[PDB]
Design a binder for this molecule. Sequence first.
Ligand SMILES: *[C@@H]1O[C@H](CO)[C@@H](O)[C@H](O)[C@H]1NC(C)=O
Lengths: 49, 50, 50, 50
Amino acid sequence: VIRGNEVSQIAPGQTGNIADYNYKLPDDFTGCVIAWNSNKLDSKPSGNY
Amino acid sequence: YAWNRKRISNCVADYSVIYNFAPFFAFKCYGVSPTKLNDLCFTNVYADSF
Amino acid sequence: PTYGVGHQPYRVVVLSFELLHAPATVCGPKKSTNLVKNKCVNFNFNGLTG
Amino acid sequence: PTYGVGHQPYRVVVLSFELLHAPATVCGPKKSTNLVKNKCVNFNFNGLTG
Ligand SMILES: *[C@@H]1O[C@H](CO)[C@@H](O)[C@H](O)[C@H]1NC(C)=O
């Protein structure tokens, strides 16, 4: 589960924060990426920590 | 019709902090890539707001 | 929940497939046909046509 | 209404256009001009320039 800013970073040949230190895809990647909003479950008024 | 231009010069530009300032999806760049804005470096920046 | 649309949580699942010379352990829903030889046919051997 | 963003209803209108193989009936808003002959001009006959 990421923030909606870094959905573009889950792609081959990318740099940033998630692609550099968290989750890096190979350059010869063959597969699919599926991302969907989860505001109903992963969001809390006090703040999901 | 009265869009504002802001003139940016003589500073160090960090483009990874722009993501923390507005909740946008796409950093839609044309001549460059948004992930390479820190390695290469420019001359002048102009910011138009409307 | 009060954040903008670019700060909402997003659930991500990445499905990566091995495309190798190994025998196909997991693959998809196709019905198999009886094998005939010495006859000009169209074959589909583990997903590749000819 | 409690479904997710992928399970919302969507209204779809598909405009199917068929091109200039017949005398034209659907036209955009443009003004015609008097026809002049035996001169080098920039014509526009039913959407094709030259
Ligand atoms: C913009 O400035 C105001 C006050 O100067 C501050 O409260 C607000 O958090 C700033 N916006 C962002 C996105 O930080």
